[PDB]
Amino acid sequence: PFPLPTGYFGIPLGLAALSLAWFHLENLFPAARMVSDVLGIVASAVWILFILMYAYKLRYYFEEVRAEYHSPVRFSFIALIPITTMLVGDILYRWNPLIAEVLIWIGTIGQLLFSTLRVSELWQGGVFEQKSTHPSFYLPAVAANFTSASSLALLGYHDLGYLFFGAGMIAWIIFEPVLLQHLRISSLEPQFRATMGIVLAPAFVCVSAYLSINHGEVDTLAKILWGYGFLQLFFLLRLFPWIVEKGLNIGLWAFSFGLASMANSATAFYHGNVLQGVSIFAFVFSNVMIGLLVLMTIYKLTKGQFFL
Amino acid sequence: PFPLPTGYFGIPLGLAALSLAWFHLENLFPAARMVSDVLGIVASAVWILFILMYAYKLRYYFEEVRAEYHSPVRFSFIALIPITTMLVGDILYRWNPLIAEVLIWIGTIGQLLFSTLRVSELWQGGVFEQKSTHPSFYLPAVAANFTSASSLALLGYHDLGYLFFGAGMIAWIIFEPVLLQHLRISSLEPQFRATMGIVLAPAFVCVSAYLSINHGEVDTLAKILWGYGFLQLFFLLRLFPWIVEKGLNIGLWAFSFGLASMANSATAFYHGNVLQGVSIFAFVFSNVMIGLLVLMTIYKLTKGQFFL
Amino acid sequence: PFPLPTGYFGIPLGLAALSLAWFHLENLFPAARMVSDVLGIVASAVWILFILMYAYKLRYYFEEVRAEYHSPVRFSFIALIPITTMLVGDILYRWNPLIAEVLIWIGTIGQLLFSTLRVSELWQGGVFEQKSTHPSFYLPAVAANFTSASSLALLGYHDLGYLFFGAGMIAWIIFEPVLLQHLRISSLEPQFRATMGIVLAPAFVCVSAYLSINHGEVDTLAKILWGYGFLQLFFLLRLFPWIVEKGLNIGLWAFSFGLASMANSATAFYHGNVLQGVSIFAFVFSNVMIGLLVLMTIYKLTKGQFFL
Ligand SMILES: CCCCCCCCO[C@@H]1O[C@H](CO)[C@@H](O)[C@H](O)[C@H]1O
Ligand SMILES: CCCCCCCCO[C@@H]1O[C@H](CO)[C@@H](O)[C@H](O)[C@H]1O
Ligand SMILES: CCCCCCCCO[C@@H]1O[C@H](CO)[C@@H](O)[C@H](O)[C@H]1O
Ligand SMILES: CCCCCCCCO[C@@H]1O[C@H](CO)[C@@H](O)[C@H](O)[C@H]1O
Ligand SMILES: CCCCCCCCO[C@@H]1O[C@H](CO)[C@@H](O)[C@H](O)[C@H]1O
Ligand SMILES: CCCCCCCCO[C@@H]1O[C@H](CO)[C@@H](O)[C@H](O)[C@H]1O
Ligand SMILES: CCCCCCCCO[C@@H]1O[C@H](CO)[C@@H](O)[C@H](O)[C@H]1O
Ligand SMILES: CCCCCCCCO[C@@H]1O[C@H](CO)[C@@H](O)[C@H](O)[C@H]1O
Ligand SMILES: CCCCCCCCO[C@@H]1O[C@H](CO)[C@@H](O)[C@H](O)[C@H]1O
Ligand SMILES: CCCCCCCCO[C@@H]1O[C@H](CO)[C@@H](O)[C@H](O)[C@H]1O
Ligand SMILES: CCCCCCCCO[C@@H]1O[C@H](CO)[C@@H](O)[C@H](O)[C@H]1O
């Protein structure tokens, strides 16, 4: 027995999001559906296993859960649980809309309850410190709201989706200023640097949610978001040797949320006949990168260097 | 004789804004007009009294005014004077557009002069400190501009209204990041905690001004603003026991600006047939809360625990 | 021989931008074209001279260039080189679209490479300090992207222009919060205060780029940007005696980017029949101010107080 590290939910997250990106190519290239189904089944299977492992953690390692919950830094990773639950719901919708809808509401209510309890509590002061200003905060504060937005849109609740979308978008703009100033002043320590991959996520996760609500209309807002997203991509590419100064590691799955959302949004740009060449590049690049993450993870597993 | 504490202008502010919310229901439910008129008359009467009291302060307690003006924290409350003057103008417009227009211009010129003189002066450095980063700064920097926007729209100056609207909206987005980071790191002391109610205001005051200019069109921007507004509401509800740790007090009128603007915007959502159930909830909730503020204020008055 | 101070590129920048503002009045008042051509030729001639001077710096004073590049503050001024190169391209487009397009791509690729190499590197921490939080950072992070946006639109690449536009707009919103908080807390030293003129630039440079892409449609976003732009103008006017506490100096060319972009955007507002009176005022004001900068620069030159 061992306690599952919460960040491992980023693996089914990235795979699930990538499944959904391929799903959105099925009417352009029908073979995309099989790719989407295989990614979706793998993501769902991994999610089930990790949910079971985390249920075991809650039962037998509760003080570890309590400590991560109350941490002004580590609490954020818990949001991966409802995020992934909603993404698995989106996948399952293609086969069973009833079960999908249950998962989507559990993850939406769960993430909103979680932020309401913990993100707000930080405003009491004295626990969060300047050094707590980490990319992981995007998970409960931003990514969870975007994922509710797009999942609720899938279910037909577009106006409710816009409320979640706005909560995420404005929360993003209100957090990022202080994050980037912190990174400029304070060198993030190597053990946390893989989480720089979360910095890729906001603009791409935002535009993918936006396009899912707005019926895939590639408008001025969508193009604006893509532009900042690519700026951040270029910055993180330049930063990559520094990010991995102390070696490649499984934490690099942090990049997969933004990469998969870049792929998803590319499908909508392509469908809309906007920047189709960029779209192709983006879709291929993100798939190659996630493919590399998969190969490195299989390798770690075959060495027995995966679970703590 | 006594010097009137400037924050007491939040009382006619909240009542005036709530009058205007009811006004906007009159064609759906005609009895709303009487409710609006009674709220409006009470707000206007209280405003007249407080303006007279503040004129007395200026004449006989000028050094107290000077000290609050030059304070990098306390100066903000002075913006309540022009804000309330414009809101009373909006109320009076239903009876006398000439007098209303005079009040609206006095409050617009007054607030813009005030910010131009004081908000900019802070950028000289060395007076404002990290500890000066309080919710009250929203008053001169954000709320005053939104109130000019909607008042100018009432008078038919929609494009000028958009200039004020943009000044407020961008000023909001540019201040809030550093406010929330400050609250996370530094516990706000109990004596200032009621001012956390001002954190409710931006998104709701923003959307209410937006809808007043844009002829009540409930569009993507409006829905985005409502979503972040509700996020902040939920956070402040969770925080409420901490806010009132040292007891209930008259400072809780700080919440009334955001509550009344939530009510006002709800009327527009309802008229637009967007999220009508949410709209009803919001309108009823804000009225109940402001009603409780009124009952607690009457009680303080009947104990002689109102004026210093 | 002497090493050219990099900030002097602000002179051809301001003149070039002002040339383009006049260009956009030619169909309303045909004599505007001659004014535009004279400004454009002067700006281009000064640019050629300064590029040659900087090429000499690179050849014979390389360690000075290296030190400014690696400085977390001084690196920003280098972005003036590609910015001005693109603006000269926009001017030359009226006579030779082929040469113009070459300059526009050199400046676009150059600025994007520059930011990708240096702006991102700051996120490694430990070099940039709180005291490095200067208005000049807008140059690589914001202004360069807006200038690419509008230049690419000139060439017909509107959707690519929107990507650059979004990169600039979101980068602006994400930097300004921490800049203004820094200015409030820390008094900027006199020797840097002229750079407060760069604070005028974002909203005006943003709206001018937006209007250049969107085919001159003066919409809600444009009006919002103008409103915040004018707020900042009023604040900087109030601050001007403090800015020039230690005397008038050539650094005041910092204001010319925002002033010229206010003029440019005014032409579009005027064409769109939005706030035409404000438009006239803005256009005349910015021209008078830049005219004063020119007269003061001629005077410095005639005293031999221009080049180091
Ligand atoms: C994803 C699930 C995370 C849940 C973490 C909940 C942490 C609650 O935390 C604990 O709850 C205890 C009661 O059991 C209280 O006695 C403790 O004071 C409190 O710290
Ligand atoms: C992801 C699903 C939501 C997790 C809900 C766990 C409920 C947390 O519970 C509460 O959080 C508070 C801290 O904010 C503590 O004061 C309480 O002791 C704790 O029980
Ligand atoms: C954080 C940055 C927010 C940018 C918001 C851009 C506003 C969207 O821009 C609007 O989009 C519409 C559809 O494309 C256009 O028709 C409008 O004219 C345009 O202003
Ligand atoms: C998100 C982008 C993924 C879409 C992959 C598109 C690859 C198809 O390639 C495109 O096929 C078209 C016909 O179908 C041709 O007209 C184009 O020239 C070709 O580039
Ligand atoms: C709402 C009204 C607030 C006005 C406060 C103005 C504060 C001006 O302040 C004082 O003005 C004096 C002249 O009377 C000067 O001698 C002082 O230096 C200056 O501090
Ligand atoms: C709400 C109506 C606007 C109030 C106008 C009061 C004018 C303030 O006046 C000035 O403010 C400056 C500080 O910025 C001081 O330098 C001056 O001494 C003071 O007179
Ligand atoms: C701080 C966040 C700003 C969000 C801006 C949202 C841009 C408004 O969004 C625009 O609104 C129009 C009317 O609903 C739509 O038709 C446009 O397509 C949509 O982008
Ligand atoms: C801002 C929201 C305030 C509006 C209050 C609406 C309360 C009216 O209630 C509504 O009345 C309708 C007919 O008028 C019915 O069709 C609806 O079922 C009912 O909910
Ligand atoms: C506008 C042009 C600015 C270019 C500045 C480049 C600064 C590069 O800097 C230097 O490059 C040297 C190689 O020449 C290396 O040996 C040094 O380590 C590096 O500091
Ligand atoms: C304005 C045109 C772009 C200038 C390109 C100069 C290339 C800078 O070059 C590199 O920058 C790095 C710092 O980020 C250093 O590590 C390298 O030593 C240096 O060569
Ligand atoms: C940082 C602030 C961003 C503000 C974004 C405003 C969104 C643009 O606003 C949109 O513009 C369209 C064209 O005018 C309108 O038709 C839309 O209804 C309006 O929401």
Ligand SMILES: CCCCCCCCO[C@@H]1O[C@H](CO)[C@@H](O)[C@H](O)[C@H]1O
């Ligand atoms: C950017 C603003 C620059 C445009 C300068 C406009 C000055 C023209 O002036 C305008 O001329 C019109 C006829 O042409 C008249 O109808 C108007 O009354 C007059 O104000």
